[PDB]
Structures are given as structure tokens and as C-alpha cells.
């Protein structure tokens, strides 16, 4: 039924501008308000504004009245909100919303600095009985990666431990636990995939 | 601007208990038209929010009846009864009443198991890192309760602070656990000038830590 589709993220130098879309679907476009909203951390939410679609006026919060310009567009039922003057405090997710559903949100970073890909190393024990394995990924920029572990067979023995900053740039780790019946009689992979620079690494850990 | 304060921050509860979620506002949330604009909002780890409970008490389509809304003025309530295991999340209380739209800080909801202790394993740097004149040493502790962790580093015998860095995982959906990872980024140099790397695990499941090392000779 109805369903918000977001832009994908972005990568935004400080005091550029971006714009960033919300095509809807399933539904009258005219009908509903779409309200736009910042996430910080994945915890704290802020509510920016919506925008009378028919009639194109805009409620505005406050705090964000300079930052944020909503419009729409009638005819491809789509949402716009462009964020100037950009600083690293608009680094968030912004979620655009209907009363009834919301998008999958966007991803902005702002940074100057550039798509960095990550380096990947192998974490295998070293020189009972179940074995954890695991792959680093270290150095990259900016979020996110995924580490797959055996084309997603291995699913639920497996820790994804959220990025933290080093020297600028990120750093995760992944670790999976098998039996030790398991490796290295059959084989273990990570696979890093890292959209933002359009890479993917695949690591076979040896014993 | 209306002010919305969720109590508690985390609410720790057993699966089939009834957990109680609080939302007070600075002013009344009772608008002008006789109507109070009052939502409740579920967020998953990893997903979007989604809609609870609006006008107060009516609950969305889809959304099960021991989820219940109640409330008036400047008080409010979410009530769960009982927790199910996919209700792990954090829970926003949101008033549409006044401009701006404000939403509470949100009140992660937390499932209760028995203490377990964490799984330690050491990774000594692979050899292929150490091309780039660095080393890291990763240590993993996972499946262990509750949060409350510690992690500390010793060379040769000695404890190490500079160049750790630590993440925590949010709590497993399946077991209830909480996982940590914890790196000590050397110089090549510096590692190849020491011997035993140690990891040190402090848990309440003992007063004693788990320790777990390596001689980079071995």
C-alpha cells in the first residue's frame, strides 16, 4: 500500500548545499502531509516540517528555518527538502514521513573528508570446542559496510559490532562462532562490501 | 516549545511482564479543537519508526492489543502486557498539537535473562597488517550479561591505555546478550618490541576477570 522511497546517502562537503527526495507511492500524493525528520545517533528525533502539497505552503520548525527548504513536486509525487550552509551537525538520518508510514530515512555525513575504502584483515586464533572467527575493517569513509559471512548462511552465530572513529576514519569488526567440526575442514569467508567507494573484499580465513 | 520527558531511559523487563513506559509534557497536549494529538512510536534496531498508538489510545491497524495508550493533559502512558521477544526496541512518545513537533528522548525497552559470562577470545595482528607498519590486536567478548563490562589491556605483564578503542553491540535479539569488541592499535615497532599481549574481561557473573594472552614468540 503506501510507501515513501527515499534518495540515497550522502557524502557533503561543510557549507555546500544537498537535496535529498521522497517519492511516494500507493496513495492520492495530494491527500497527505509529508513531514520531514532528523534522527541523531539513531536515538534523538527532531521534527523539521511539512508541506501542503496542493497549495505548496510549509509549516517550518523554528530551529531549522535557514537550514531547510520543503517543496514538492505534484506531478512525480515526490518530496524535496534541500539543507543549506551545511555544517557536521547536520550529519544525521532524515526520515520523511506520512502520518501513516515513513521512508527508510537518508543517510547524510558531512565531512571533507573523502570516500575512503576500508582495509580488511583476518582474525583467526593464533598459535573449546566451538571456534570464533572474525574480519576487520578498518580505515574506511564514510558508513557503511556489511560483513556477510558465507553468502549469509551463517546469520545467527554472528556479532556485528557497530563503527567507532580512529584517526578520522572508521574502524568495525565482525565475528562469526562455529562449530569447531566446522573450520577449517569447510571453508569460513567474509565478505566486506563497502557501497560508498564501490567495493567489496572477500577474505577465506585460514587456520 | 512543548517539552516531551520519557521516564525511564531504559526499562529492563521479563518477557510476559507488563512494562510501563511514562511521557509528561511541559505544557497540555489537548489542542484548541478538543483533540490531543499524542503518538507512540516503536523503533527496531535498524529500521524505521513505526506507528504505535495515535489520538492517545487508538491503536494503528496491525498492531496488537496489549499494546494500550492512555493519557490526558500532560500525562501519559504506554503500557505493554505482556512482552514478546520482537518488542525489543526504543519507544517515542510525540505530540502534533503545538509547531514545533517535539518528540520524548525515547525509552529503550530491555530483556531481561540470566547472568552469563562473556566469551573471550584474543587475536593476535595478522601478518598481512603489519606490510603497513601497524598493528591491532583484537579482542572479542560476546554473550555475556548484563551491559556492564570491562575490558583491560596489559603488555608484558603491564597495563595498557593508550591506543584502545571499544564498541558494544545492542542486545541480541535471540539470547538477550550483549557482545564487545576491543582493539589495541600499536606501531609495528613498538609490537614487535613485547612479548605477551593480554585481554582481561571484568563481569559480575565473578570477582575475578577472565584473562586471555599470547607470547608473540608462539
Known amino acids: 500500500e503506501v510507501q515513501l522511497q527515499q534518495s540515497g546517502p550522502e557524502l557533503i562537503k561543510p557549507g555546500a548545499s544537498v537535496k535529498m527526495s521522497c517519492e511516494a507511492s500507493?496513495?492520492?500524493?495530494?491527500?497527505?502531509?509529508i513531514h520531514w525528520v532528523k534522527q541523531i545517533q539513531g536515538r534523538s528525533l527532531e521534527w523539521i516540517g511539512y508541506?501542503?502539497?496542493?497549495?505548496?505552503?510549509?509549516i517550518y520548525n523554528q530551529n531549522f528555518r535557514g537550514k531547510a527548504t520543503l517543496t514538492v513536486n505534484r506531478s512525480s509525487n515526490t518530496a524535496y527538502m534541500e539543507l543549506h550552509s551545511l555544517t557536521s551537525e547536520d550529519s544525521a538520518v532524515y526520515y520523511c514521513?506520512?502520518?501513516?508510514?515513513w521512508g527508510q530515512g537518508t543517510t547524510l555525513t558531512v565531512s571533507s573528508a573523502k570516500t575512503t575504502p576500508p582495509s580488511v584483515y583476518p582474525l583467526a586464533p593464533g598459535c573449546g570446542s566451538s571456534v570464533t572467527l572474525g574480519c576487520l575493517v578498518k580505515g574506511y569513509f564514510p558508513e557503511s559496510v556489511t560483513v556477510t559471512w558465507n553468502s549469509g548462511s551463517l546469520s545467527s552465530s554472528v556479532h556485528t559490532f557497530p563503527a567507532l572513529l580512529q584517526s578520522g576514519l572508521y574502524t568495525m569488526s565482525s565475528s562469526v562462532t562455529v562449530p569447531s567440526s566446522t573450520w577449517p575442514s569447510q571453508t569460513v569467508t567474509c565478505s566486506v562490501a563497502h557501497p560508498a567507494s564501490s567495493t567489496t573484499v572477500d577474505k577465506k580465513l585460514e587456520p | 516549545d512543548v517539552l516531551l520527558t520519557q521516564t525511564p531511559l531504559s526499562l529492563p523487563v521479563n518477557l510476559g511482564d507488563q512494562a510501563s513506559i511514562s511521557c509528561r509534557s511541559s505544557?497540555?497536549?489537548?489542542?484548541?479543537?478538543?483533540?490531543?494529538?499524542l503518538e507512540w512510536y516503536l523503533q527496531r534496531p535498524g529500521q524505521s519508526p513505526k506507528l504505535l498508538i495515535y489520538?492517545?489510545?487508538k491503536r494503528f491497524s496491525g498492531i496488537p492489543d496489549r499494546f494500550r495508550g492512555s493519557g490526558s493533559g500532560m500525562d501519559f502512558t504506554l503500557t505493554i502486557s505482556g512482552v514478546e521477544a520482537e518488542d525489543l526496541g526504543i519507544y517515542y512518545c510525540?505530540?502534533?498539537?503545538?509547531?514545533?513537533?517535539?518528540f520524548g528522548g525515547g525509552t529503550k525497552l530491555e530483556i531481561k535473562r540470566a547472568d552469563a559470562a562473556p566469551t573471550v577470545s584474543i587475536f593476535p595482528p595478522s601478518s598481512e597488517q603489519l606490510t603497513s607498519g601497524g598493528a591491532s590486536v583484537v579482542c572479542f567478548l560476546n554473550n555475556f550479561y548484563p551491559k556492564d563490562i570491562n575490558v583491560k589491556w596489559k603488555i608484558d605483564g603491564s597495563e595498557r591505555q593508550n591506543g584502545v578503542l571499544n564498541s558494544w553491540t545492542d542486545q541480541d535479539s535471540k539470547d538477550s546478550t550483549y557482545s564487545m569488541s576491543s582493539t589495541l592499535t600499536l606501531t609495528k615497532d613498538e609490537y614487535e618490541r613485547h612479548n605477551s599481549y593480554t585481554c582481561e574481561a571484568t563481569h559480575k557473573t565473578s570477582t575475578s576477570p577472565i584473562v586471555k594472552s599470547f607470547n608473540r614468540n608462539e
Open positions: 514521513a506520512r502520518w501513516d508510514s
Open positions: 500507493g496513495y492520492i500524493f495530494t491527500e497527505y502531509y
Open positions: 508541506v501542503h502539497p496542493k497549495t505548496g505552503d510549509v
Open positions: 505544557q497540555t497536549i489537548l489542542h484548541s479543537d478538543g483533540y490531543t494529538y
Open positions: 489520538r492517545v489510545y
Open positions: 510525540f505530540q502534533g498539537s503545538y509547531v514545533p513537533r517535539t
